[PDB]
Amino acid sequence: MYKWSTEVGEIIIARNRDGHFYINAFVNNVKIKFMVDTGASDIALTKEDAQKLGFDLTKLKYTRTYLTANGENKAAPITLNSVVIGKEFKNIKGHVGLGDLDISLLGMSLLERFKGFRIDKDLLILNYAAAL
Amino acid sequence: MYKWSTEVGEIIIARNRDGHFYINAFVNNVKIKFMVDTGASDIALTKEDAQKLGFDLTKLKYTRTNKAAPITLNSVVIGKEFKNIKGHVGLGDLDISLLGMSLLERFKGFRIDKDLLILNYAAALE
Amino acid sequence: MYKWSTEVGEIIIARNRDGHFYINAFVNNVKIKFMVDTGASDIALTKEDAQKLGFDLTKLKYTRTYLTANGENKAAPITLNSVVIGKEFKNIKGHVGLGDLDISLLGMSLLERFKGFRIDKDLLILNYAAAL
Amino acid sequence: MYKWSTEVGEIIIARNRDGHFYINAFVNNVKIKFMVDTGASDIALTKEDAQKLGFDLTKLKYTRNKAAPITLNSVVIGKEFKNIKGHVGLGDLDISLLGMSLLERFKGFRIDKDLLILNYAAAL
Ligand SMILES: [Cl-]
Ligand SMILES: [Cl-]
Ligand SMILES: [Cl-]
Ligand SMILES: [Cl-]
Ligand SMILES: [Cl-]
Ligand SMILES: [Cl-]
Ligand SMILES: [Cl-]
Ligand SMILES: [Cl-]
Ligand SMILES: [Cl-]
Ligand SMILES: [Cl-]
Ligand SMILES: [Cl-]
Ligand SMILES: [Cl-]
Ligand code: NA
Ligand code: NA
Ligand code: NA
Protein backbone atom coordinates (compact mmCIF):
# COMPACT_ATOMS: atom_id res chain seq x y z
CA MET A 1 0.00 0.00 0.00
CA TYR A 2 1.54 3.21 -1.17
CA LYS A 3 -0.72 6.06 -0.17
CA TRP A 4 -0.42 9.71 -1.01
CA SER A 5 -2.75 12.63 -0.47
CA THR A 6 -2.79 16.42 -0.96
CA GLU A 7 -4.84 18.88 1.04
CA VAL A 8 -6.23 21.59 -1.32
CA GLY A 9 -7.63 24.40 0.74
CA GLU A 10 -8.85 27.95 0.80
CA ILE A 11 -8.99 30.76 3.34
CA ILE A 12 -11.46 33.62 2.70
CA ILE A 13 -11.23 36.79 4.72
CA ALA A 14 -13.73 39.62 4.62
CA ARG A 15 -12.40 43.15 4.67
CA ASN A 16 -12.67 44.78 8.09
CA ARG A 17 -14.94 47.85 8.29
CA ASP A 18 -11.73 49.83 8.91
CA GLY A 19 -10.68 49.04 5.30
CA HIS A 20 -7.95 46.45 6.15
CA PHE A 21 -7.65 42.70 5.98
CA TYR A 22 -6.52 40.81 9.02
CA ILE A 23 -5.39 37.23 9.35
CA ASN A 24 -4.47 34.98 12.32
CA ALA A 25 -1.46 32.73 11.77
CA PHE A 26 0.34 30.27 13.99
CA VAL A 27 3.96 31.30 14.08
CA ASN A 28 6.09 28.64 15.81
CA ASN A 29 2.84 27.38 17.35
CA VAL A 30 1.83 30.79 18.66
CA LYS A 31 -1.26 32.60 17.39
CA ILE A 32 -0.28 35.95 15.96
CA LYS A 33 -2.63 38.51 14.33
CA PHE A 34 -1.41 40.11 11.12
CA MET A 35 -2.61 42.95 8.97
CA VAL A 36 -2.15 42.20 5.29
CA ASP A 37 0.11 44.87 3.62
CA THR A 38 0.81 44.60 -0.11
CA GLY A 39 3.49 47.32 0.38
CA ALA A 40 5.48 45.01 2.69
CA SER A 41 7.89 42.44 1.33
CA ASP A 42 8.86 40.41 4.37
CA ILE A 43 6.91 40.07 7.61
CA ALA A 44 7.10 42.97 10.06
CA LEU A 45 6.67 41.84 13.69
CA THR A 46 5.80 44.14 16.54
CA LYS A 47 8.22 44.01 19.45
CA GLU A 48 5.46 42.50 21.61
CA ASP A 49 4.86 39.66 19.05
CA ALA A 50 8.62 39.06 18.77
CA GLN A 51 8.73 38.64 22.54
CA LYS A 52 5.73 36.27 22.48
CA LEU A 53 7.79 34.19 20.06
CA GLY A 54 10.72 34.11 22.54
CA PHE A 55 13.02 36.54 20.69
CA ASP A 56 15.47 38.35 22.98
CA LEU A 57 15.20 41.91 21.73
CA THR A 58 18.52 42.90 23.30
CA LYS A 59 20.45 40.23 21.29
CA LEU A 60 18.97 41.08 17.89
CA LYS A 61 21.20 43.12 15.55
CA TYR A 62 19.35 46.02 13.87
CA THR A 63 20.86 46.02 10.32
CA ARG A 64 17.81 46.15 7.93
CA THR A 65 16.62 49.66 6.92
CA TYR A 66 12.84 49.78 7.01
CA LEU A 67 12.07 53.57 7.26
CA THR A 68 13.18 56.70 5.28
CA ALA A 69 13.48 58.79 8.47
CA ASN A 70 16.91 59.78 9.77
CA GLY A 71 17.64 58.43 13.31
CA GLU A 72 15.27 55.45 14.09
CA ASN A 73 15.89 53.41 10.97
CA LYS A 74 16.78 49.71 11.11
CA ALA A 75 14.94 46.63 12.04
CA ALA A 76 16.50 43.32 12.99
CA PRO A 77 16.01 40.62 10.38
CA ILE A 78 14.73 37.31 11.69
CA THR A 79 13.69 34.08 10.24
CA LEU A 80 10.49 32.42 11.38
CA ASN A 81 10.87 28.68 11.56
CA SER A 82 7.23 27.95 10.97
CA VAL A 83 4.24 30.05 9.79
CA VAL A 84 0.97 28.21 9.46
CA ILE A 85 -1.88 29.82 7.53
CA GLY A 86 -3.77 26.82 6.13
CA LYS A 87 -0.48 25.23 5.21
CA GLU A 88 2.85 25.39 6.91
CA PHE A 89 5.52 27.65 5.46
CA LYS A 90 9.07 27.30 6.61
CA ASN A 91 11.89 29.76 7.31
CA ILE A 92 9.95 32.91 6.51
CA LYS A 93 11.79 36.20 6.41
CA GLY A 94 10.80 38.91 8.76
CA HIS A 95 12.13 41.75 10.75
CA VAL A 96 11.40 43.38 14.04
CA GLY A 97 11.12 47.07 14.22
CA LEU A 98 11.67 49.48 16.87
CA GLY A 99 8.26 49.77 18.54
CA ASP A 100 6.14 52.15 16.46
CA LEU A 101 4.42 49.15 14.91
CA ASP A 102 0.77 48.84 15.98
CA ILE A 103 0.15 45.45 14.41
CA SER A 104 2.37 42.89 12.74
CA LEU A 105 2.35 42.91 8.98
CA LEU A 106 2.15 40.10 6.51
CA GLY A 107 3.62 41.09 3.17
CA MET A 108 4.04 39.99 -0.40
CA SER A 109 6.96 37.62 0.16
CA LEU A 110 4.77 35.21 2.17
CA LEU A 111 1.60 35.87 0.16
CA GLU A 112 3.34 35.06 -3.13
CA ARG A 113 4.09 31.57 -1.84
CA PHE A 114 0.41 30.58 -1.85
CA LYS A 115 -0.71 28.71 -4.97
CA GLY A 116 -3.30 31.46 -5.24
CA PHE A 117 -3.70 34.86 -3.64
CA ARG A 118 -6.44 37.31 -4.71
CA ILE A 119 -7.93 40.48 -3.26
CA ASP A 120 -11.27 41.03 -4.90
CA LYS A 121 -12.86 44.19 -3.53
CA ASP A 122 -14.06 43.29 -0.05
CA LEU A 123 -12.57 39.74 0.03
CA LEU A 124 -9.11 38.23 0.30
CA ILE A 125 -8.85 34.69 -1.00
CA LEU A 126 -5.91 32.41 -0.38
CA ASN A 127 -5.65 29.03 -2.10
CA TYR A 128 -3.07 26.43 -1.10
CA ALA A 129 -2.02 22.86 -1.66
CA ALA A 130 -0.02 20.89 0.98
CA ALA A 131 1.32 17.32 0.86
CA LEU A 132 -0.62 15.08 3.39
CA MET B 1 -11.67 33.39 8.57
CA TYR B 2 -13.59 30.92 6.51
CA LYS B 3 -11.49 27.84 5.83
CA TRP B 4 -12.24 24.79 3.72
CA SER B 5 -10.17 21.93 2.33
CA THR B 6 -10.42 18.75 0.16
CA GLU B 7 -8.15 15.78 0.45
CA VAL B 8 -7.19 14.42 -2.97
CA GLY B 9 -5.56 11.08 -2.67
CA GLU B 10 -4.33 7.92 -4.29
CA ILE B 11 -3.73 4.33 -3.15
CA ILE B 12 -1.39 2.17 -5.17
CA ILE B 13 -1.19 -1.52 -4.53
CA ALA B 14 1.32 -3.86 -6.09
CA ARG B 15 0.06 -7.23 -7.24
CA ASN B 16 0.98 -9.98 -4.81
CA ARG B 17 3.33 -12.72 -6.06
CA ASP B 18 0.27 -15.02 -5.80
CA GLY B 19 -1.39 -13.06 -8.67
CA HIS B 20 -4.00 -11.23 -6.47
CA PHE B 21 -4.36 -7.76 -5.09
CA TYR B 22 -4.88 -7.25 -1.35
CA ILE B 23 -6.11 -4.09 0.41
CA ASN B 24 -6.46 -3.19 4.07
CA ALA B 25 -9.59 -1.31 4.90
CA PHE B 26 -11.06 -0.01 8.14
CA VAL B 27 -14.54 -1.32 8.37
CA ASN B 28 -16.54 0.19 11.30
CA ASN B 29 -13.14 1.13 12.74
CA VAL B 30 -11.67 -2.27 12.47
CA LYS B 31 -8.75 -3.12 10.11
CA ILE B 32 -9.78 -5.84 7.71
CA LYS B 33 -7.65 -7.39 4.95
CA PHE B 34 -9.50 -7.89 1.71
CA MET B 35 -8.64 -9.72 -1.43
CA VAL B 36 -9.83 -7.74 -4.49
CA ASP B 37 -12.25 -9.79 -6.62
CA THR B 38 -13.43 -8.05 -9.85
CA GLY B 39 -15.90 -10.93 -10.27
CA ALA B 40 -17.60 -10.00 -6.97
CA SER B 41 -20.24 -7.32 -6.72
CA ASP B 42 -20.73 -6.70 -2.97
CA ILE B 43 -18.34 -7.48 -0.10
CA ALA B 44 -17.97 -11.03 1.17
CA LEU B 45 -16.94 -11.22 4.81
CA THR B 46 -15.48 -14.19 6.54
CA LYS B 47 -17.38 -15.24 9.72
CA GLU B 48 -14.42 -14.30 11.78
CA ASP B 49 -14.30 -10.76 10.30
CA ALA B 50 -18.09 -10.47 10.81
CA GLN B 51 -17.65 -11.32 14.52
CA LYS B 52 -14.82 -8.80 14.86
CA LEU B 53 -17.28 -6.28 13.58
CA GLY B 54 -19.77 -7.25 16.29
CA PHE B 55 -22.20 -9.21 14.10
CA ASP B 56 -24.08 -11.85 15.99
CA LEU B 57 -23.87 -14.76 13.53
CA THR B 58 -26.81 -16.54 15.21
CA LYS B 59 -29.18 -13.58 14.46
CA LEU B 60 -28.32 -13.25 10.80
CA LYS B 61 -30.74 -14.89 8.35
CA TYR B 62 -28.88 -16.98 5.74
CA THR B 63 -30.60 -17.40 2.32
CA ARG B 64 -29.24 -18.80 -1.04
CA THR B 65 -26.83 -17.93 -4.03
CA ASN B 66 -23.97 -22.11 -0.23
CA LYS B 67 -26.17 -19.82 1.90
CA ALA B 68 -25.27 -16.21 2.85
CA ALA B 69 -26.77 -13.53 5.13
CA PRO B 70 -26.92 -10.00 3.63
CA ILE B 71 -25.45 -7.25 5.78
CA THR B 72 -24.76 -3.55 5.52
CA LEU B 73 -21.50 -2.08 6.62
CA ASN B 74 -21.88 1.36 8.26
CA SER B 75 -18.42 2.54 7.32
CA VAL B 76 -15.66 1.32 4.98
CA VAL B 77 -12.56 3.53 4.87
CA ILE B 78 -10.02 3.00 2.09
CA GLY B 79 -8.42 6.44 1.75
CA LYS B 80 -11.87 7.97 1.97
CA GLU B 81 -14.92 6.87 3.93
CA PHE B 82 -17.78 5.05 2.17
CA LYS B 83 -21.10 4.58 3.98
CA ASN B 84 -23.63 1.77 4.18
CA ILE B 85 -21.86 -0.66 1.90
CA LYS B 86 -23.51 -3.94 0.93
CA GLY B 87 -21.99 -7.25 1.96
CA HIS B 88 -22.86 -10.74 2.94
CA VAL B 89 -21.55 -13.44 5.28
CA GLY B 90 -21.51 -17.06 4.11
CA LEU B 91 -22.06 -20.25 6.18
CA GLY B 92 -19.43 -22.10 4.15
CA ASP B 93 -15.76 -21.44 4.85
CA LEU B 94 -14.26 -18.27 3.17
CA ASP B 95 -10.50 -18.07 3.28
CA ILE B 96 -10.26 -14.22 3.08
CA SER B 97 -12.79 -11.46 2.87
CA LEU B 98 -13.50 -10.19 -0.61
CA LEU B 99 -13.85 -6.65 -1.91
CA GLY B 100 -15.85 -6.41 -5.13
CA MET B 101 -16.77 -4.03 -7.93
CA SER B 102 -19.69 -2.32 -6.19
CA LEU B 103 -17.26 -0.64 -3.76
CA LEU B 104 -14.36 -0.25 -6.18
CA GLU B 105 -16.56 1.53 -8.75
CA ARG B 106 -17.34 4.26 -6.26
CA PHE B 107 -13.80 5.67 -6.38
CA LYS B 108 -13.27 8.72 -8.60
CA GLY B 109 -10.62 6.60 -10.34
CA PHE B 110 -9.94 2.83 -10.39
CA ARG B 111 -7.43 1.14 -12.67
CA ILE B 112 -5.60 -2.18 -12.79
CA ASP B 113 -2.51 -1.73 -14.95
CA LYS B 114 -0.60 -5.02 -15.19
CA ASP B 115 0.78 -5.41 -11.72
CA LEU B 116 -0.64 -2.25 -10.08
CA LEU B 117 -4.04 -1.35 -8.76
CA ILE B 118 -4.57 2.40 -8.54
CA LEU B 119 -7.38 4.07 -6.72
CA ASN B 120 -7.96 7.84 -6.79
CA TYR B 121 -10.37 9.70 -4.50
CA ALA B 122 -11.41 13.20 -3.27
CA ALA B 123 -12.99 13.68 0.16
CA ALA B 124 -14.12 16.83 2.04
CA LEU B 125 -11.96 17.53 5.13
CA GLU B 126 -13.25 18.53 8.56
CA MET C 1 3.04 5.52 -17.62
CA TYR C 2 -0.04 6.08 -15.62
CA LYS C 3 -1.44 9.59 -15.42
CA TRP C 4 -4.50 10.73 -13.56
CA SER C 5 -5.72 14.20 -12.62
CA THR C 6 -8.59 15.93 -10.83
CA GLU C 7 -9.76 19.54 -11.06
CA VAL C 8 -10.47 20.81 -7.47
CA GLY C 9 -12.37 24.05 -7.60
CA GLU C 10 -14.37 26.63 -5.71
CA ILE C 11 -17.09 29.12 -6.50
CA ILE C 12 -17.70 32.03 -4.14
CA ILE C 13 -20.81 34.16 -4.45
CA ALA C 14 -21.61 37.32 -2.56
CA ARG C 15 -25.14 37.72 -1.26
CA ASN C 16 -27.16 40.13 -3.41
CA ARG C 17 -28.35 43.36 -1.64
CA ASP C 18 -31.86 41.85 -2.02
CA GLY C 19 -30.87 39.11 0.52
CA HIS C 20 -30.59 36.23 -2.01
CA PHE C 21 -27.77 34.34 -3.60
CA TYR C 22 -27.78 34.00 -7.36
CA ILE C 23 -25.72 31.67 -9.53
CA ASN C 24 -25.29 31.51 -13.31
CA ALA C 25 -25.14 28.02 -14.65
CA PHE C 26 -24.80 26.66 -18.12
CA VAL C 27 -27.73 24.28 -18.75
CA ASN C 28 -27.34 22.35 -22.01
CA ASN C 29 -24.87 25.00 -23.15
CA VAL C 30 -27.20 27.94 -22.22
CA LYS C 31 -26.55 30.47 -19.49
CA ILE C 32 -29.36 30.43 -16.94
CA LYS C 33 -29.60 32.56 -13.82
CA PHE C 34 -30.77 30.73 -10.71
CA MET C 35 -31.71 31.87 -7.29
CA VAL C 36 -30.41 29.51 -4.57
CA ASP C 37 -33.34 28.13 -2.46
CA THR C 38 -32.40 25.67 0.36
CA GLY C 39 -36.18 25.18 0.73
CA ALA C 40 -36.41 23.72 -2.81
CA SER C 41 -35.56 20.15 -3.80
CA ASP C 42 -35.23 19.78 -7.61
CA ILE C 43 -34.60 22.64 -9.97
CA ALA C 44 -37.58 24.84 -10.66
CA LEU C 45 -37.46 26.46 -14.09
CA THR C 46 -39.51 29.42 -15.16
CA LYS C 47 -41.62 28.92 -18.24
CA GLU C 48 -39.39 31.40 -20.09
CA ASP C 49 -36.12 29.52 -19.14
CA ALA C 50 -37.76 26.22 -20.15
CA GLN C 51 -38.53 27.77 -23.54
CA LYS C 52 -34.91 29.07 -23.86
CA LEU C 53 -33.83 25.48 -23.31
CA GLY C 54 -36.09 24.31 -26.19
CA PHE C 55 -38.85 22.74 -24.10
CA ASP C 56 -42.24 22.83 -25.86
CA LEU C 57 -44.52 23.80 -23.03
CA THR C 58 -47.58 22.38 -24.84
CA LYS C 59 -45.98 18.86 -25.02
CA LEU C 60 -44.98 18.75 -21.37
CA LYS C 61 -47.41 16.87 -19.20
CA TYR C 62 -48.10 18.72 -15.93
CA THR C 63 -48.47 15.62 -13.83
CA ARG C 64 -46.71 16.83 -10.67
CA THR C 65 -47.90 18.99 -7.80
CA TYR C 66 -45.60 21.12 -5.68
CA LEU C 67 -46.68 22.40 -2.23
CA THR C 68 -45.37 26.01 -2.22
CA ALA C 69 -45.68 29.16 -0.10
CA ASN C 70 -48.78 30.08 -2.18
CA GLY C 71 -49.74 26.40 -1.79
CA GLU C 72 -50.36 23.77 -4.46
CA ASN C 73 -49.01 24.35 -7.97
CA LYS C 74 -48.95 22.11 -11.01
CA ALA C 75 -45.63 21.28 -12.72
CA ALA C 76 -44.16 19.15 -15.52
CA PRO C 77 -41.14 17.08 -14.55
CA ILE C 78 -38.06 17.37 -16.78
CA THR C 79 -34.49 16.14 -16.86
CA LEU C 80 -31.62 18.48 -17.67
CA ASN C 81 -28.94 16.67 -19.66
CA SER C 82 -26.15 18.97 -18.54
CA VAL C 83 -25.82 21.57 -15.77
CA VAL C 84 -22.40 23.17 -15.43
CA ILE C 85 -21.59 25.14 -12.29
CA GLY C 86 -17.80 24.68 -11.98
CA LYS C 87 -18.20 21.01 -12.76
CA GLU C 88 -20.63 19.34 -15.10
CA PHE C 89 -23.57 17.56 -13.53
CA LYS C 90 -25.59 15.15 -15.66
CA ASN C 91 -29.30 14.32 -15.87
CA ILE C 92 -30.40 16.70 -13.20
CA LYS C 93 -34.03 16.65 -12.14
CA GLY C 94 -36.23 19.67 -12.56
CA HIS C 95 -39.72 20.76 -13.25
CA VAL C 96 -41.50 23.63 -14.94
CA GLY C 97 -44.42 25.43 -13.38
CA LEU C 98 -47.39 27.14 -15.14
CA GLY C 99 -46.35 30.59 -14.15
CA ASP C 100 -45.93 31.18 -10.44
CA LEU C 101 -42.19 31.88 -10.98
CA ASP C 102 -40.04 35.05 -11.26
CA ILE C 103 -36.67 33.36 -11.38
CA SER C 104 -35.52 29.81 -11.73
CA LEU C 105 -34.54 28.03 -8.55
CA LEU C 106 -31.65 25.83 -7.73
CA GLY C 107 -32.43 23.59 -4.79
CA MET C 108 -30.88 21.12 -2.41
CA SER C 109 -30.96 18.12 -4.73
CA LEU C 110 -28.29 19.76 -6.95
CA LEU C 111 -26.49 21.65 -4.13
CA GLU C 112 -26.03 18.44 -2.11
CA ARG C 113 -24.03 16.94 -4.89
CA PHE C 114 -21.13 19.40 -4.39
CA LYS C 115 -18.19 18.16 -2.27
CA GLY C 116 -18.70 21.31 -0.18
CA PHE C 117 -21.58 23.79 0.16
CA ARG C 118 -21.48 26.51 2.83
CA ILE C 119 -23.22 29.78 3.48
CA ASP C 120 -21.19 32.08 5.80
CA LYS C 121 -21.48 35.87 6.53
CA ASP C 122 -23.05 36.99 3.15
CA LEU C 123 -21.02 34.41 1.17
CA LEU C 124 -21.98 31.17 -0.49
CA ILE C 125 -19.05 28.83 -1.09
CA LEU C 126 -19.26 25.77 -3.37
CA ASN C 127 -16.34 23.34 -3.53
CA TYR C 128 -16.12 20.59 -6.16
CA ALA C 129 -13.84 17.96 -7.58
CA ALA C 130 -14.11 16.68 -11.16
CA ALA C 131 -12.08 13.83 -12.76
CA LEU C 132 -9.72 15.08 -15.59
CA MET D 1 -18.91 34.82 -8.82
CA TYR D 2 -15.24 34.29 -7.85
CA LYS D 3 -14.00 31.07 -9.26
CA TRP D 4 -10.64 29.38 -8.74
CA SER D 5 -9.45 25.90 -9.50
CA THR D 6 -6.37 23.68 -9.04
CA GLU D 7 -5.53 20.56 -11.07
CA VAL D 8 -4.14 17.87 -8.69
CA GLY D 9 -2.47 15.02 -10.49
CA GLU D 10 -0.12 12.06 -10.36
CA ILE D 11 2.18 10.25 -12.71
CA ILE D 12 3.26 6.68 -11.88
CA ILE D 13 6.01 4.98 -13.78
CA ALA D 14 7.03 1.38 -13.48
CA ARG D 15 10.73 0.60 -13.51
CA ASN D 16 11.79 -0.78 -16.85
CA ARG D 17 13.18 -4.34 -16.85
CA ASP D 18 16.53 -2.72 -17.74
CA GLY D 19 16.62 -1.17 -14.24
CA HIS D 20 15.81 2.43 -15.29
CA PHE D 21 12.83 4.75 -15.18
CA TYR D 22 11.75 6.45 -18.39
CA ILE D 23 9.35 9.45 -18.67
CA ASN D 24 7.74 11.06 -21.67
CA ALA D 25 7.60 14.86 -21.44
CA PHE D 26 6.33 17.49 -23.84
CA VAL D 27 9.09 19.99 -24.44
CA ASN D 28 7.83 23.02 -26.36
CA ASN D 29 4.98 20.79 -27.56
CA VAL D 30 7.23 17.94 -28.65
CA LYS D 31 7.08 14.57 -26.98
CA ILE D 32 10.57 13.64 -25.78
CA LYS D 33 11.53 10.45 -23.95
CA PHE D 34 13.77 10.92 -20.95
CA MET D 35 15.66 8.54 -18.72
CA VAL D 36 15.48 9.63 -15.08
CA ASP D 37 18.95 10.22 -13.65
CA THR D 38 19.05 11.18 -9.93
CA GLY D 39 22.77 11.93 -10.46
CA ALA D 40 21.91 14.67 -13.01
CA SER D 41 20.98 18.19 -12.01
CA ASP D 42 19.67 19.98 -15.15
CA ILE D 43 18.28 18.28 -18.27
CA ALA D 44 20.72 16.69 -20.66
CA LEU D 45 19.38 16.62 -24.29
CA THR D 46 20.80 14.50 -27.05
CA LYS D 47 21.80 16.36 -30.25
CA GLU D 48 18.94 14.58 -32.03
CA ASP D 49 16.35 15.75 -29.47
CA ALA D 50 17.81 19.25 -29.64
CA GLN D 51 17.21 19.14 -33.43
CA LYS D 52 13.67 17.91 -32.97
CA LEU D 53 13.15 21.04 -30.89
CA GLY D 54 14.43 23.20 -33.74
CA PHE D 55 17.85 23.97 -32.19
CA ASP D 56 20.46 24.67 -34.85
CA LEU D 57 23.42 22.42 -33.81
CA THR D 58 25.87 24.71 -35.63
CA LYS D 59 24.83 27.76 -33.48
CA LEU D 60 25.20 26.05 -30.09
CA LYS D 61 28.26 27.14 -28.09
CA TYR D 62 29.97 24.35 -26.22
CA THR D 63 31.38 26.06 -23.12
CA ARG D 64 32.96 25.15 -19.59
CA ASN D 65 33.73 18.19 -20.60
CA LYS D 66 32.00 20.97 -22.50
CA ALA D 67 28.26 20.94 -23.22
CA ALA D 68 26.15 23.78 -24.70
CA PRO D 69 23.78 25.29 -22.11
CA ILE D 70 20.19 25.87 -23.23
CA THR D 71 16.90 26.93 -21.77
CA LEU D 72 13.68 25.16 -22.52
CA ASN D 73 10.67 27.47 -22.69
CA SER D 74 8.19 24.82 -21.68
CA VAL D 75 8.50 21.33 -20.18
CA VAL D 76 5.15 19.62 -19.47
CA ILE D 77 5.07 16.48 -17.32
CA GLY D 78 1.59 16.60 -15.87
CA LYS D 79 2.06 20.27 -15.10
CA GLU D 80 3.91 22.86 -17.08
CA PHE D 81 7.35 24.01 -15.97
CA LYS D 82 8.82 27.15 -17.57
CA ASN D 83 12.37 28.11 -18.59
CA ILE D 84 14.04 24.93 -17.50
CA LYS D 85 17.81 24.66 -17.63
CA GLY D 86 19.42 22.07 -19.82
CA HIS D 87 22.43 21.41 -21.90
CA VAL D 88 23.40 19.58 -25.02
CA GLY D 89 26.32 17.21 -24.68
CA LEU D 90 28.93 16.75 -27.51
CA GLY D 91 30.27 13.68 -25.97
CA ASP D 92 27.64 11.25 -27.02
CA LEU D 93 24.40 10.82 -25.18
CA ASP D 94 22.10 7.79 -25.95
CA ILE D 95 18.90 9.16 -24.32
CA SER D 96 18.04 12.49 -22.96
CA LEU D 97 18.21 12.75 -19.20
CA LEU D 98 15.85 14.30 -16.71
CA GLY D 99 17.57 15.21 -13.46
CA MET D 100 16.90 16.33 -9.90
CA SER D 101 16.52 20.02 -10.61
CA LEU D 102 13.26 19.38 -12.49
CA LEU D 103 12.14 16.41 -10.33
CA GLU D 104 12.49 18.41 -7.11
CA ARG D 105 10.00 21.00 -8.38
CA PHE D 106 7.14 18.43 -7.98
CA LYS D 107 4.98 18.59 -4.86
CA GLY D 108 5.75 14.88 -4.41
CA PHE D 109 8.52 12.75 -5.86
CA ARG D 110 9.11 9.24 -4.60
CA ILE D 111 10.96 6.17 -5.93
CA ASP D 112 9.31 3.47 -3.88
CA LYS D 113 9.80 -0.06 -5.10
CA ASP D 114 10.01 -0.49 -8.81
CA LEU D 115 7.77 2.60 -8.99
CA LEU D 116 8.41 6.28 -9.49
CA ILE D 117 5.53 8.46 -8.30
CA LEU D 118 5.20 12.14 -9.07
CA ASN D 119 2.45 14.26 -7.50
CA TYR D 120 1.73 17.79 -8.64
CA ALA D 121 -0.69 20.65 -8.20
CA ALA D 122 -1.12 23.35 -10.86
CA ALA D 123 -3.18 26.55 -10.51
CA LEU D 124 -5.79 27.09 -13.20
CL1 LIG E 1 9.37 34.66 2.96
CL1 LIG F 1 -4.76 40.69 -5.81
CL1 LIG G 1 0.44 26.48 -1.77
CL1 LIG H 1 -14.82 1.48 17.47
CL1 LIG I 1 -16.09 -17.97 6.79
CL1 LIG J 1 -21.88 -1.01 -2.02
CL1 LIG K 1 -13.86 9.76 -4.72
CL1 LIG L 1 -26.46 43.53 -5.33
CL1 LIG M 1 -17.01 17.45 -14.49
CL1 LIG N 1 -30.80 16.40 -8.89
CL1 LIG O 1 -17.89 17.74 -6.28
CL1 LIG P 1 3.61 20.67 -7.86
NA1 NA Q 1 -18.09 -17.74 4.99
NA1 NA R 1 -15.31 -20.32 9.55
NA1 NA S 1 25.29 14.65 -25.52
UniProtKB/TrEMBL annotation, chains A, C:
A GO biological process held by the record: proteolysis
Residue ranges that the Swiss-Prot or TrEMBL entry lists as coiled coil: none
A GO term for molecular function: aspartic-type endopeptidase activity
Thylakoid in keyword set: no
Keyword vocabulary terms for this entry: Acyltransferase, Membrane, Transferase, Transmembrane, Transmembrane helix
Record-given protein name: Aspartyl protease
Species the sequence originates in: Rickettsia conorii (strain ATCC VR-613 / Malish 7)
Lineage: Bacteria, Pseudomonadati, Pseudomonadota, Alphaproteobacteria, Rickettsiales
Parent-protein residues present: 105 to 231 of 231
UniProtKB/TrEMBL annotation, chain D:
Keyword annotations of the record: Acyltransferase, Membrane, Transferase, Transmembrane, Transmembrane helix
An example molecular function term from Gene Ontology annotations: aspartic-type endopeptidase activity
Gene Ontology BP term (one): proteolysis
Protein name stated in the entry: Aspartyl protease
Organism: Rickettsia conorii (strain ATCC VR-613 / Malish 7)
